[PDB]
TrEMBL record, chain A:
Residues of the full protein shown: 20 to 177 of 2177
Localization (cell): Host cytoplasmic vesicle membrane; Host nucleus, Host nucleolus; Virion
Coiled coil (UniProt feature): none
Assigned protein family: Belongs to the picornaviruses polyprotein family.
Native source species: Human parechovirus 3
Source organism superkingdom: Viruses
The name this protein goes by in its record: Genome polyprotein
Primary role: Forms an icosahedral capsid of pseudo T=3 symmetry together with capsid proteins VP0 and VP1. The capsid is 300 Angstroms in diameter, composed of 60 copies of each capsid protein and enclosing the viral positive strand RNA genome. Capsid proteins interact with host alpha-V/beta-3 integrin heterodimer to provide virion attachment target cell. This attachment induces virion internalization predominantly through clathrin-mediated endocytosis. Binds packaging signals present in the viral RNA. Cysteine protease that generates mature viral proteins from the precursor polyprotein. In addition to its proteolytic activity, it binds to viral RNA, and thus influences viral genome replication. RNA and substrate bind cooperatively to the protease.
Subunit field text: Interacts with capsid protein VP0, and capsid protein VP3 to form heterotrimeric protomers. Five protomers subsequently associate to form pentamers which serve as building blocks for the capsid.
TrEMBL record, chains E, F:
Similarity section: Belongs to the picornaviruses polyprotein family.
Full protein stretch here: 20 to 72 of 2177
Location of this chain's protein in the cell: Host cytoplasmic vesicle membrane; Host nucleus, Host nucleolus; Virion
Function as written in the Swiss-Prot or TrEMBL entry: Forms an icosahedral capsid of pseudo T=3 symmetry together with capsid proteins VP0 and VP1. The capsid is 300 Angstroms in diameter, composed of 60 copies of each capsid protein and enclosing the viral positive strand RNA genome. Capsid proteins interact with host alpha-V/beta-3 integrin heterodimer to provide virion attachment target cell. This attachment induces virion internalization predominantly through clathrin-mediated endocytosis. Binds packaging signals present in the viral RNA. Cysteine protease that generates mature viral proteins from the precursor polyprotein. In addition to its proteolytic activity, it binds to viral RNA, and thus influences viral genome replication. RNA and substrate bind cooperatively to the protease.
Organism: Human parechovirus 3
Protein's recorded name: Genome polyprotein
Lineage, top ranks: Viruses, Riboviria, Orthornavirae, Pisuviricota, Pisoniviricetes
Signal peptide: none
C-alpha cells in the first residue's frame, strides 16, 4: 500500500517531464499518494484509543471514545473575583470544623458537690447536631479521626 | 485527512487542506488580496458597531412633561440588528429634537435603575436646545458590572424631560451606537438567533 | 492486611456491546441500594476485548483484621445500559468473577483452625 | 477565633492540656488507606444523572433528555450537592461531563449533546436550530464511538449563583437521525450521563433550611 | 483523540491552580488522559500479530 | 496565661501539618493566642492612668 | 492497560497500575509498612514449616514388642496442613514417651525402605529414657534422591521398639517439623488441593 501510492506519484513524475502543464499530470494526480494515507487513521483506529478516566473513588473505563469537544478557549477558574462575597472558601476544608454550641441551663443548691452536672456526648454529638458537618458529610462517610478543641463558658454575677 | 465528526479535537477548524492539486482554480491557492484601502474591519468587529442608526422612535404627546422613562432595548435594534448573540458594551447615544422654532429646551440623562421621586438633574443633565444635534457618550458603572443579561432587554432606561412648553406639538429622535465594544464577544456565538422565524 | 483485587470478565461475541458498573462498599451493610452510586465505582465497556479490574485499598481500623467471619464489604454489578443483540447474535452474554489478594498483603501468626480437617 | 465565628471572652483561666499531646494526623497505621477526602474531595465526582427512553416515535428535531441546572447536584440525594450545599447558599464551580450511550452493533443513529448557557431559553424560535449548533457541543455517531467527553467552564451573567434557584447551564441531548431498527434487535438503547466537578467553592453561609 | 485526552488533563490543570486538594481536580481526573490510551492496544490489535510458527 | 495562649496556638500548629486548609486549624484558631492578650489592657488598667493636670 | 485474559505474557502479574488518581485512599499509594519486629517470615516460607505440631497419634498396646513399623504420611498433617502442593524436604522428628515411672527405655530409628528381618540397631538407634523429650533430626539420602512423590504418602516408615516391659501400659507421641525446606517449592502450586470437599 504505502509504497504503491508513491508509485502512482512516481508515474505522475513519469509524465511530468512534460511542463504541460505544469503538469502536474492530469488531473492534479500529483497526489494519488493520498493523505498518509488511506491508513489508518483515527476513526476505527481502535483500540483507536480506549480511555480510562478516573475520579475520586470512581473509575470509568470506556471502550469507544469520540473527542474532548471543548467550547472556545475556556480558561476556567477559580474566582474571579470580583469579589463574590469575600468569604473564602471554605472547609470542608473548612466549614465542617468550628465552634459550635452544645449546652444548656441548670443549677442552684439541690446539688451536693459530688452530684453530676452536664455530660456532653461523644463524637456522635456533632453528627446528630443539626448544623455543621457532623451532619452533612459525616452523614455520608462512616469513619472519623479528628482532634478536639474546647472553650467552656460559665459566667456568674459578681 | 478528510475529518471525522464526533472526533478530535475542538472547535477550531483548519486549513481545510491544500488540495486539489491546483487545478488551476480548482481547489485552492486562494490567497487573500485585500481590495479596500484597507480598513478591512468591514469583516472585523468594533467598526461595524461603531456605525449607528437603529431605532427611529419615541414620538411625543405634549401634555404634559415628566418622562415617561423609556426602556432602551438596545435591540431592536431593529435595522442592522441581524448581528449578535452576546452581552455587554459601553454606549454612545445620539439625541435629536424637532420642535418649536427655536423656542424650547430639552433636558435628558440616564440610568440605572428602578425608580425615584425626583429631581432628575442630580444623576445628570444635558440641556439640548431646539433643533440641534444628537450628541452624548456614556461610560458605564453600576451598571452593576457583571456585564448585562444580553436579552433583558436591554437593561436600562432613558429619562427625557421637555422643560417648558410652547403650546404646539413636539417630537424627538434617539439613535444609538456603542463604541470600542469590550464584548469580546463573550460565549460566542451561542444565542444562534436563527429565528428567521420572522 | 491487604486488598482483594477483583476481576470481572464478560463473554460475548464481537457484534454486541454494552456498559455496566460495579459497586463495592468496604464496611459493610445489608443491601443497601443506589448508594452503590455513592461509593466506589468502575465503569465497564464490552467490547474488544475483556476483561476488567477494580481494586480496593485496605480499609479498616486497627492494623490486622481477623480472618474469620468478622467483616468485609458488599458487591453488586449494575446494568445501566442494555447489552444489545442483533438478528444473528448470541442474545445471551455473561460474566465470571475471580478475586485474588496482593501485592501489598501478608499474613501474621499461625493458628490451628480448622475446617475438619478438611 | 474560628472559621466565621469569633469568641471574645473576658476572664480566661488556663489552657490545661493533658500530657504531651503531640496529636495528629494519621497514624497510620493504616486506617483504611482512603485519604482523605474532599470536600476537599468527596463532594466532587462523577455521579449518575440519567435514564432510559428511545425508539422511533421521535422525529429528528424532537427533544430527548434534558439534564437539570446546578440544582441537580443539590437535589441529588447523594454527594455534596446535598450535604454541604444544603448548608451554604453560594456555588461557583466548573463542570466536567462524560456521556455514555452504548448501542448494539449493526445500527446507526446520531445523538447530539449541547450545553445551552442560559440564553433566556426564550422560545428558541423555530428556525434557529443551526443555530443550536454553534455552541460548545458534541455529536455522537453511535455506529462507532460508544462514549463522549465534554468539558464546560461555566459562564453566567452574575459572578455567583444561588444554590438551587438561580441556575446556569442545562444539558440537552437532542436526537439526530432517528434510530435505525434492523429486524430484529432490542428496541431501547437508553442514555446515561455521569458528571464530575472541578475545584469547587461554597461561600456566604445562611441557616439550615432556608 | 490523542491530543483530546491531554485536553481533558489540561482542563484538570485548569482547575488545579486550586491546591484544594491537591487537587488533583475531582475526581482524580488527573488522568482522563487514559492509558496510551483507549488505543489500541493489544487485543484486536490485528493484524494484532499473525504468528507463523 | 501568657504561655497558655501560645499553647493553644502550638496545638493549632499541632494540626497545621495538614495543609488542609490551610489550615489554619479550624476555625481560624490560628489566633487563640488572643490580642496580647486578655490582658490587660487599657480600661481598668488603673491606676490605669491617674492624670494630674 | 486494563489487561486481557488469554493475552500476554506469562504467569507473573504486575503492579496492577497506580490508579486512581489518589484518592486519598482510594485506589493506591499502598506502601508496605512492616508492623512486626520484623521477622516478616510469617508470610515467608521456611519459618512456618519450621514450627511443629502435627499428628498426635500412635497409641501403644503393650503386647508385645517388635514394631509395627508405622507409615508417617507427613500429611496428615493434619492440623496446620492447610498449607501445600509440592514435594520434598529433610525432616526434624520429635519423639515423646509416656510410660512406667522411669522404669523403661525406648529405641527408635528410620528409614527407608521395604522390609528386613532383623537387628534394627544397624540402621541406627536413639535410646530415649522414660519420660523424656522428643528430639531428633534426620538428614536425607537414599532416600532415592529424585525428591519424593508428594502424595504417596509420604514415602517412609518409622521403627519403634519398646525394649523390655514393665507389666503396665505404655504410650508414645510423634511430632514432626521439617526445617530449611529446599522445597523451592517445586512446580508451585499445582495440587490446588481445594478439596474443602471436607
Amino acid at each position: 500500500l504505502s509504497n504503491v501510492e508513491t508509485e502512482a506519484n512516481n508515474i505522475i513524475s513519469g509524465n511530468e517531464v512534460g511542463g504541460e502543464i505544469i503538469t502536474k499530470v492530469a488531473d492534479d494526480a500529483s497526489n494519488l499518494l493520498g493523505p498518509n494515507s488511506f491508513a489508518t487513521t483515527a476513526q476505527p483506529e481502535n483500540k483507536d484509543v480506549v480511555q480510562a478516566t478516573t475520579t475520586v473513588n470512581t473509575t470509568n473505563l470506556t471502550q469507544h471514545p469520540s473527542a474532548p469537544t471543548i467550547p472556545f478557549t475556556p480558561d476556567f477558574r477559580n474566582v474571579d473575583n470580583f469579589h463574590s462575597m469575600a468569604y473564602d472558601i471554605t472547609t470542608g476544608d473548612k466549614n465542617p470544623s468550628k465552634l459550635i454550641r452544645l449546652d444548656t441551663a441548670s443549677w442552684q443548691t439541690s446539688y451536693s458537690r459530688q452530684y453530676k452536672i452536664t455530660t456532653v456526648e461523644l463524637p456522635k454529638s456533632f453528627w446528630d447536631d443539626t448544623r455543621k458537618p457532623a451532619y452533612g458529610q459525616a452523614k455520608y462517610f462512616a469513619a472519623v479521626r479528628c482532634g478536639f478543641h474546647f472553650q467552656v463558658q460559665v459566667n456568674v454575677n459578681q | 485527512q478528510s475529518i471525522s465528526p464526533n472526533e478530535l479535537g475542538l472547535t477550531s477548524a483548519q486549513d481545510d487542506g491544500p488540495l486539489g492539486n491546483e487545478k488551476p482554480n480548482y481547489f485552492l491557492n486562494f490567497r487573500t488580496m485585500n481590495v479596500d484601502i484597507f480598513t478591512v474591519s468591514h469583516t472585523k468587529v468594533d467598526n461595524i458597531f461603531g456605525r449607528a442608526w437603529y431605532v427611529a422612535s419615541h414620538d411625543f404627546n405634549n401634555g404634559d412633561t415628566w418622562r415617561q422613562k423609556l426602556t432602551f432595548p438596545k435591540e431592536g435594534h431593529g435595522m442592522l440588528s441581524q448581528f449578535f448573540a452576546y452581552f455587554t458594551g459601553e454606549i454612545n447615544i445620539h439625541i435629536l429634537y424637532m420642535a418649536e422654532q427655536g423656542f424650547l429646551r430639552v433636558a435628558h440623562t440616564y440610568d440605572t435603575e428602578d425608580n425615584r421621586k425626583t429631581f432628575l438633574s442630580s444623576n445628570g443633565v444635558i440641556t439640548i436646545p431646539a433643533g440641534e444635534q444628537m450628541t452624548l457618550s456614556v461610560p458605564f458603572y453600576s451598571n452593576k458590572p457583571l456585564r448585562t443579561v444580553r436579552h433583558d432587554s436591554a437593561l436600562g432606561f432613558l429619562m427625557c424631560r421637555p422643560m417648558m412648553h410652547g403650546t404646539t406639538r413636539t417630537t424627538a429622535e434617539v439613535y444609538i451606537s456603542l463604541r470600542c465594544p469590550n464584548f469580546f464577544f463573550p460565549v460566542p456565538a451561542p444565542k444562534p438567533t436563527g429565528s428567521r422565524a420572522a | 492486611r491487604g486488598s482483594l483485587i477483583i476481576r470481572l470478565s464478560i463473554y460475548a461475541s464481537t457484534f454486541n456491546r454494552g456498559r455496566l458498573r460495579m459497586g463495592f462498599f468496604p464496611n459493610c451493610t445489608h443491601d443497601t441500594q443506589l448508594e452503590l452510586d455513592n461509593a466506589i465505582y468502575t465503569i465497564c465497556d464490552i467490547g474488544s476485548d475483556n476483561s476488567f479490574e477494580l481494586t480496593i485499598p485496605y480499609s479498616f481500623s486497627t492494623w490486622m483484621r481477623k480472618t474469620h467471619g468478622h467483616q468485609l464489604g458488599l458487591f453488586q454489578v449494575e446494568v445501566l445500559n442494555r447489552l444489545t443483540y442483533n438478528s444473528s447474535s448470541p442474545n445471551k452474554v455473561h460474566c465470571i468473577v475471580q478475586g485474588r489478594l496482593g501485592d501489598d498483603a501478608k499474613f501474621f501468626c499461625p493458628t490451628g483452625s480448622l475446617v475438619s480437617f478438611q | 477565633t474560628t472559621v466565621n465565628t469569633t469568641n471574645l471572652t473576658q476572664h480566661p483561666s488556663a489552657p490545661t492540656i493533658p500530657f504531651t499531646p503531640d496529636f495528629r494526623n494519621v497514624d497510620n497505621f493504616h486506617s483504611m488507606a482512603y485519604d482523605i477526602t474532599t470536600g476537599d474531595k468527596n463532594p466532587s465526582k462523577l455521579i449518575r444523572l440519567d435514564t432510559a427512553s428511545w425508539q422511533t416515535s421521535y422525529s429528528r428535531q424532537y427533544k430527548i433528555t434534558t439534564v437539570e441546572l446546578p440544582k441537580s447536584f443539590w437535589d441529588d440525594t447523594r454527594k455534596p450537592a446535598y450535604g454541604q450545599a444544603k448548608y451554604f447558599a453560594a456555588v461557583r464551580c466548573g463542570f466536567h461531563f462524560q456521556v455514555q450511550v452504548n448501542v448494539n452493533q449493526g445500527t446507526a443513529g446520531s445523538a447530539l449533546v449541547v450545553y445551552e448557557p442560559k440564553p433566556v431559553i426564550d422560545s428558541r424560535q423555530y428556525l434557529e436550530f443551526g443555530s443550536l449548533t454553534n455552541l460548545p457541543h458534541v455529536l455522537m455517531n453511535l455506529a462507532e464511538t460508544t462514549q463522549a467527553d465534554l468539558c464546560i467552564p461555566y459562564v453566567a451573567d452574575t459572578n455567583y449563583v444561588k444554590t438551587d434557584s438561580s441556575d446556569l447551564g442545562q444539558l440537552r441531548v437532542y436526537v439526530w437521525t432517528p434510530l435505525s431498527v434492523p429486524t430484529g434487535a432490542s428496541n431501547e438503547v437508553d442514555v446515561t450521563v455521569m458528571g464530575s466537578l472541578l475545584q469547587l467553592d461554597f461561600q456566604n453561609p445562611r441557616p439550615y433550611g432556608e
